[PDB]
Each structure stands twice: as C-alpha cells, then as structure tokens.
Amino acid sequence: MLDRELESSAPGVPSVSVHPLLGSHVVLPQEPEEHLWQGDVGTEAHPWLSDHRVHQVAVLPGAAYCEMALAAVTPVLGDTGEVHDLKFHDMLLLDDATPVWVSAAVTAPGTAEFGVETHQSGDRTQRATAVLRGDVDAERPAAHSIDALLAAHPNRVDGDELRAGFGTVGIGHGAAFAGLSEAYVATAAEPTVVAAVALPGPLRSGQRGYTVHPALLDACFQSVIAHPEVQNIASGMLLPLGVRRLRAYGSTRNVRYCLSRIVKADSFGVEADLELLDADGTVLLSAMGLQLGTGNSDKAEEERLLDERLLTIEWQQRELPRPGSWLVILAGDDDENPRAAGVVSALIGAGMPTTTMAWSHDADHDAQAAALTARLDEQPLAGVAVIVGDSEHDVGADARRGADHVRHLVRIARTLADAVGEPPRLYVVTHRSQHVLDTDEPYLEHSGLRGLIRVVGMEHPRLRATQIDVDDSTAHEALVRQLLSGSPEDETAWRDGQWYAARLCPSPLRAAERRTAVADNASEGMRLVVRNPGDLESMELVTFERGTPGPGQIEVAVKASSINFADVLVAFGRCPSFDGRLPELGSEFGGVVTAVGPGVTTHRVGDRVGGVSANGCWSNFVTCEADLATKLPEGISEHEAAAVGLAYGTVWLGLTELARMSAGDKILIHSATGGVGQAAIAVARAAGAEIYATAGSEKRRQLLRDWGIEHVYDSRTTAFADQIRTDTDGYGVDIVLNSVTGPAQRAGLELLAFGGRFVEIGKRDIYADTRLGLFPFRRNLSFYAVDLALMTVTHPQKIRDLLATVYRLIADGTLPLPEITHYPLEEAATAIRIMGGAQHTGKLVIDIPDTGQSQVVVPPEQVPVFRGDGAYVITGGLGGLGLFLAERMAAAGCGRIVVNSRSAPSTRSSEIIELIRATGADIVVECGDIAEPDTALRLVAAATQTGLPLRGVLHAAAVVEDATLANITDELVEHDWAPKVYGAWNLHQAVQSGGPATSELDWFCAFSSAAALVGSPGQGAYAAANSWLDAFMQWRRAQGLPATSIAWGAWGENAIAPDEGAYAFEAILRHDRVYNGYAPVLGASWLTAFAQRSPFAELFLA
Amino acid sequence: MLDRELESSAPGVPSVSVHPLLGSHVVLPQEPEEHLWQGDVGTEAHPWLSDHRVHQVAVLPGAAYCEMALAAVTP
Amino acid sequence: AGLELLAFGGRFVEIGKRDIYADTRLGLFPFRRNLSFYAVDLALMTVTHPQKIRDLLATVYRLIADGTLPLPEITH
C-alpha cells in the first residue's frame, strides 16, 4: 500500500483533523489569541468513557482533562510545553451526550489561561482549569533501569486484586480502565512504586491523536494507591484533584511502566510524582505533583457504614398457603390451657391422630424424658406442638418464671434432638411473647424462649424449630390451619383472625425513628425547617438548645418573622447561596430582647428590636449579633417591622442609595404586586418616579391598574421591552429593579437609556454565570448586583443602618406600609404553597405563637446524651465494653459516672481510672451484684448524691457460659440469665423508686448480643437471656419510660472495631428506635448459611 | 481496497466534514443559540477565487456570501 | 481578571470603550459579591447630559485652582 500513500497525495474531500476529546477548534476574532474547542465526552460518542464510573455512574476522570490540557498547549503556543496548576472541580457525570467547551487564552507571552466548562440548562459549570507554558526548558529526566527498578521492588500487587478493592469505596474501573497489570513495591520507608501499565487492546486501536490516553494516565494514578503507606493511612475514597506540572517529552504509545513516588501521605490526601517510562526506561511523560484527596469525607463514610450495619425485625401481614400423627405437649400441668384443649380438638377434627403429654415443672424430668422418647419410637409422627403455660402483670415474677420456662425448654429440646428415627417438626407456641403490632404490650415469661428456638433451629435443623406467637382472641380452628399447611417460616405471629410473619431487614430510618417531644411555646427552643427540600409536607417543627448569648450577640424573643421569596426557594431546594450551604428559613424578625451577651452597651434587655440573622427566624427565640439588630421606633411594632425590613431595605438600598432615584425619571419594577414590588412602588412614588410595572397574573395586572398605575405589562415575556419603548416614544426607562431572568433580564438592560441604572436583585442569573453582553453599556449604564443576605455577613453595619432607616421612614409615615397578610406559624407551609403559586399579594407575616401553649416538636441530634449537668450509671463498667464507654463518656463531657461490677477493679482497670480521675471528671466506683436489689438502689443514690440528676443508664453487665444443647445445665442458665435480666428489673425499679433525680433520665440502654437474633450454635443460654431483655426493653418503652437495646457483634479490643461502636452507640441513643442490631454483615458465612436455611432472612440472599 | 479498509478498521485518524468556505463550526456556550464558523477564502485554499477580480485585484464575489448564508441556515 | 480581583465592595469603573463596543459577553458570576459595574463615556455625556459635564469640569477647575488637587506632569 505504497500506491495507497501516493494515491492519497492527490485528491481532497472537504474535512479537517480534530482531537478526539477537545473537538472542533475555532480561534476567536479578537486580540489576544483566544481559542475555543467544543467536543463531546459522551458515552455514545466515546463508549470507553463509560468504563470509569463512581457509584454506578459514568463520570469524566481527572486524566481526561490532563490530556485536554496537554493537547491544548501545542495549538496555542506552537512549541514544546508544560501544563501548570491543573485543577479539577465538579465531577462531570456523563450521558449519551455531554458537550464540553475547552478554552485557552493567551494572557502573557508563552503563557495561557486554560479552561474546561459545561453549559446545560443555562448553568455554566467550570469542570477544569490550568495555565499553559511554552517558555519552559526541556530538562528531560534521566532514564531508569527498568529491570534494576523491578529488582528493588519485589512485593507484587496484582492489578485485578487492587481494582476489586477500588469497587468497595465506590470507584469502578471497567475493561478500558484495567490498564494497570501489576504494581511492585517494597516497604513503607521506600516511597516508590514500579507499575507495569499498558493501554488495553480496544484503546491501542483508538490511540488516534492523544498526547497520552486518559485511560492510561488514569492507570498510573491507580498505581499510586498500591503503595503500602497509601493503603495504611488514607484508607477511604481517594480521587484526583489536580496536577502541579505535566510535561510530555514524546510518544506515550510505547509506554510499559510507570514510576510513582510519594511526596506526602496524610489522612486527608496523598501527593505524588509520576514518570511514565518505555521498555528502555526512558521518560515519556512526567506528571509531577499529582494530588489525590477526598471530597467524599470521612464523616459521610461512617454515616453510610452505620446504615449498612444496623438490623431490625419487621412483621408482614401474610396468608396461609397450601394444600400423619401428632403430639401436643404442655409445659404447665396445674395451669389448664384452653389453647392446648382447643388445639387437640381441632387436630382430631381435621382428621389427624393426636396424643397428649403433661410435662410440668417440679416433676421427675428423667422419667418424663424416657416416657417421651418411648412415644417417639412407638409411633412415627409428623410434628410435635410444645404449648407453654400462662401466668394468668408483675415483671419481677415474669423474670423469675422466665428462667424456669427456659430451663424446661432445654430439657424438652435435648430429647427431640436425640431421636433414632427422623426427628419430627417442632412447633413452639407462646402467649403474646413479642411485639408485632405497634399497640401491643408484650406478655413476658415466654420472651426469652425466642432466643433458644433460634439456637435450636441452627444446632439441630432436622426438626425445623418454628415459633408461633399467639394471643387470647384468635380461634383454635385458624391455629391448626398453620400447623397442617407446613409453611417454611421459623418465626410467626397471630393477632385476631390475621396472620403475621417475621422477616429480618436493615432499617436505619430517621423520620418516625427520630426522637419526638412536646415543648412550650413561651419557653423552650422551637425552630421550623424542611428535613428534605422539594417536599412541603416535610416541613417540620424542630427543637433546639436555647443557649446563653454572647459575646457581642443577643437572644431575641420573636413575636413575628417574614416569608420572603428567598424562604420559598429554600423550601424547594432552589435557593442560590455564595456560602454553598442551603440557608435556614426566615431572614428577618420582630421581637424583644431576652438576654444581652457579654458585653454590649447598645442593646439592653426588654427593648423592642427588629433584625436579621439567618439561623432560622421562624422560631420563638433567635440569637442574632449586636451588629444585626436595631431598636424599633414608637411608630412600628414587631409584626410591622417583620414585613418591612428586607423588602424596603433591598428597595431603599437599590433605588435611592445605589441608583439615586431622582424625581420624574422612569422606573421599571418587575412583579410589583409582591413584597419588594409594593415597597418599590412606595419609594418610587415618594420620589415621584414614573412607574412602569409588570405581573404574570391578569388579576395581579388589573390590580396594578386599580392602584392607579398605568403602564402594566406581562412579566413572563420580553414584550414589556418593546411595549414600554412605544409607550415612552422610544426613550425607554432610567432605572430597572430586575427580579426577572434571562431574556427578560437582558431585555431590561436593552430598554433603559443613558441614565441607565440596572439594579439586579435576581440571583439566578449571577449564580449561573450568564455572560451578559456589555454592548448596551455604550450609553453610560451602571449594573448593580445586590445580595443583602451576603452583606449581612460582609458589611453588617450597612444592613443595621439600612434596617434602621426603613423602620424610621415607615414609623414616621414617610412611606406607607404594604399588604400584610398575617399567618400562624403552623400554616407556614400553606404560605409557601400560595407564594409558590404566585397567588399572594404583598408581604406575608408569620405570627409566632405567644402564650404558653404546647406544640409537638422533633429533637434530631440536639439530644443531650453526654452532658455535665447530669449523672450516669454503667453496670459491668470495670471491664471490657463498659470500661471503654466510661473513658469515652468522661471524654465526651459527663458529670459524675457511677461505674459498677461485682468484681473489684482489675489492675489494668485501676490504672485506667487513675488517669481518668486526674483529667477533670470523676469516676465513682460502686461494687455490688446488680442481681441483688440493694445494689441498683445504692448505684442510683451514689450518682445523685453530688446534687446532679440521673440522665442515663447502660447495661453492659453479662456472664457468658456457652455450651451445646446436650450439656446445658439448669445452673448454667441461671448464671447467664441472672445479670442480664434481674439487673434490668432492679435498674428499672431503682429509677422509679428514686425521687425527682432519677425521674428525669434521657435514656436506658441494654447491651444485648446478635447471637440472640441469628442463633449462634453453642450460645443457647446466653442467647435466651438476651431475647427476654430485648422484649423487656420494648415493654419498658410501652409503659412510657425511655428504653434502648443494641445487639452487639464481635469486638476487637469482618469483626466490629472499638471506635466503630462508640460512634454507633451515640447515633442509636439520639434516635427513638427501641431494638437495634449492630453486627458485621458484608457476605458472611453464618449469614449466607442462615438465608438459605430459613425465609426469615429472605432479603439478605437477594 | 477491501483489505486497506479492514486493516484501517482499527487505526482511524479523527477528522470531521466541514463546509468549503464556512469551515470549522462551533456553537458558543451561551443563550441564545449562537453559532460561529472560521474559514479560509484565500487564493491558495480556493484557487478558483483568483478568477474573480475587480480592477485586476482578486476579490470575494457577492455570490460567496450568498452561499455562506444559505449554508448557515440548516445548522 | 480585574473584575475577579475586587471583593465585596466591588466597584468596577470601566472607562475603556474597546470591550463594550465589541459586545464582550462578561461573565456575571463574580457579581455574587455585591459588585457594581460602571460604564463611562464623557464624550457621549457631552451630548446626552451636557449640564452634568459642565458641572464636572467646573468642579475639577475649582478643586485644582483651590489646590485641593495637584496638577500632573504637563508637557507642552
């Protein structure tokens, strides 16, 4: 194909060569040399770009702009060049089409500002920026010895093995981004990484006109993570943020290795320097100063892990599906069970030959066990139904009986396991054992038996250990229906004629699963805010900690705040802010000073003031700075100053202060039936300015005609421009108060003439970087951006004097106040629905609830868990978990912690208490056995003694004596059950028995174990002691007392870590969820084994 | 060449079709829809343009701008 | 670059006519800090509002004659 090359040197189809990414290049007709490329970085355009994806979404890698910059040097600065200070900003998420505009302009000689950006929906978004340099000297780094380098680095990291680990943090590298074959390292001291990279087959064909392929350059950035110091330290989501210097010394076609070097390695990020080598070891590209940090914070990682780790049992309303001999055994003979009578009659009624056994307590258990084993070998039976005797309200008694009930189930369970033939199906029937319907008050006794049947279903799965929770009102005809249907659910319940089925699942919600309360309106802190903007039904009243003000601040008792159009957007998430953080609802207020912070001479207590703050002014109490409040004149009230403040302010500033509104000059006021619009009409009228106004609604336009203003146009058009131009004989206006956007924003500028004063109050267009054409400014115009909100922060003394003059001007009566529609704080949602609909006219005021009336509030993470003004108790606090939380609680700022354990302080524990007592806070140690009642009273009395009320309890007390079903003794059950359950009832009783000191506690938590939920074989006794305690906690909550239970996994000092549980504990205490299950899940062996055996864990298999 | 096309079905040079006069086209990232072309109308690029000359000097005929306008309609 | 420089107070006084008559699309994003752009064309003002120019000359001739302002390097 020589012929082919000599053939080609002859014709010409009209085309031009372009870069794959950058795209079509045009140079702008303007001095200086300004360039502009426009190219698609879409997934349909460049399929290969879909293989790099974050959280299952294709995004543009850093390396993609690295190339874009490197490319852009040679066309701008016709020479060899470096790319300086390359920064990436927002993460470009890709679609089938994603157009991007690269733009490089010369600024100084051999220097050019480089910039990548994307325009969608009118919002320009700068995705990457740099400087380009062509004046730098070619100081080619010395070539390395590829083979020698590999000798110094023997520790081989497989590429795949590293790319699997990437997918766990959320970064996916598909087939195209699999270039990194392997990386060789040495130790944490040696800071280098040899990486054998290569461009994949699909892309070696598509190398086209790349300086360096982004897929390849990204493959070298992957190699930086292979380093041991990087794996050890920054063990989170690492993303590239920029590169200080990027130079290509030639063709990166033939690049087989990358030589990385770590500069700095920190928890925040990793700086590194790279060198792409060929087989000869000669440097082809040097990316020196690559920064890889973490935007996706270490706090959001914890929050996300916590959510995947929690488990709770949920009940589904189910129906009995589809379509042998039986034995109905009892656990109490002196108690006559109508359930056992009615079930034996319904099985014989259905046509099954059913026998009966009366195994009771205080009986010859060895003789009755032999009698049972004889009945099994005598006749082959399908199933065995174990009915448990009912007390037929005292918990103290149900806790003592609960042991005798468990011990009795262990004796029955051991005989059914030791069967010659096929063991029959076990159906344990309990009376209101656990909580299913929200209305239920659980009947204990049987509460502890759900842990044993869960352990028996795991140890001996031949007999499918099923549980059936039953109530009094239900009918025996429907109960036997379940026994003969043979459904595989191992945990079920019955309430009335409906049937309920258990199913395990993670549910870390924060809506109804959040703390609730009732608070006074005159006293106690209550703010109003949306939990998730967009939904107005999500508008909640929330409580806050009303604190002492100062220094140089004030706490104002609000009588009335306003509803500005700002406050509407915020509700819908549509609000722009320089801060970035979505502002808090309500800007201005009208109230009275409650407390003046140390130390200010201007403000005094009891003064009627009006101000601004942010921090949520739709509340009973607002803390504002001294700078941001001003005393009200005798002429206006708290409700009158609430409406006026920002509207008249924004207008005063705008028209008289900036634009210097003269008399007679023509002013345009967009949407003049609104708040700021009425205020505009007022000052424009005072001033004598000829008003030209707009409105969207014809009702609201005829409303402006009724206000004696001719020259009313549609605000939702660009017609007003040419309508006003005709209605002014081609003169146009003088001032434009521009609330309106885009074509209507540009149209206003085009309208006003010579005098030309454009007051832009509308943020949308500025925070979208709408590039306004300067041409009309040829007539001596003046653009004025306004952001009062920001001024409140930058120059608050202006905003103070502005609020002050508008309160004076209106109180004097210089300006008349506008349409004020008062609303109750409750119906603040409806104001937004109306204002959002544009139905309203003028200002809407929200009246704050006066009078000590109660309102249901919602404390989120303002819950005072660890507080100095309260006392704490920690049973089992001299070892293991309980002692770790005692050190963390003192550290968290707690006053008086009474630790306890039956054993005296251990030697390493006595050393931990010495160092904690020296560091401020006190750790009172009170020995005793929580099983004895006097011990729990002694602990409470000790914690209160130092004039501090009891604000929290923890139950880490436990005894773990594990054994297989065959060797679980009656004595061993008492040792595990006694501290777990008898300590809870004593701790419960001590709190009620105590005076007002203990009738104020915020929480009461019990440290259970996930082996109760799962059924770890060998636990049994310890698993049953926990199940009762999980139900007791739910009973304590039913009565009204606070109660919490956390089923903990496997602790360190794959597995639960020490600091992992402390943060998890504090999270769970702040929420109103009663039962919690913190345990490792991932793809464990015990979970995959449990999911396939029973349908309780159906959602885990997936 | 069926062969040359199959072996070239792998290393393809990135190029794009353009108008002879208008040339390279870019739509600016701004409202309203604003387009922009840059192109050569020189005698080296378009030899035939040297044949139209006013007072012995080569000039762009009126007809060239007609074509440019007609071309710019559809995009 | 000059617009991007000024902060909060932000008072950009463009006396230079080249970029205005060129219809340069000026990115509005820097204005988020309460900036203020002022176009100045005394030449046009002399026609549209000659009284303001009369007073503007009269006030500088007064300030410079009073000595309030010192005159600059003048080369005849």
Ligand SMILES: NC(=O)c1ccc[n+]([C@@H]2O[C@H](COP(=O)([O-])OP(=O)(O)OC[C@H]3O[C@@H](n4cnc5c(N)ncnc54)[C@H](OP(=O)(O)O)[C@@H]3O)[C@@H](O)[C@H]2O)c1
């Ligand atoms: N710091 C500042 O820069 C600052 C401070 C406060 C206020 N302002 C601005 O002033 C403007 C008006 O505030 P305001 O509360 O005093 O007046 P407003 O009239 O109370 O606000 C509602 C107005 O917004 C217009 N509108 C446009 N699109 C709308 C939509 N999707 N939904 C509802 N209404 C829509 C309506 O115009 P029609 O009459 O045409 O239907 C309506 O009259 C806002 O842009 C606000 O941010 C600026």
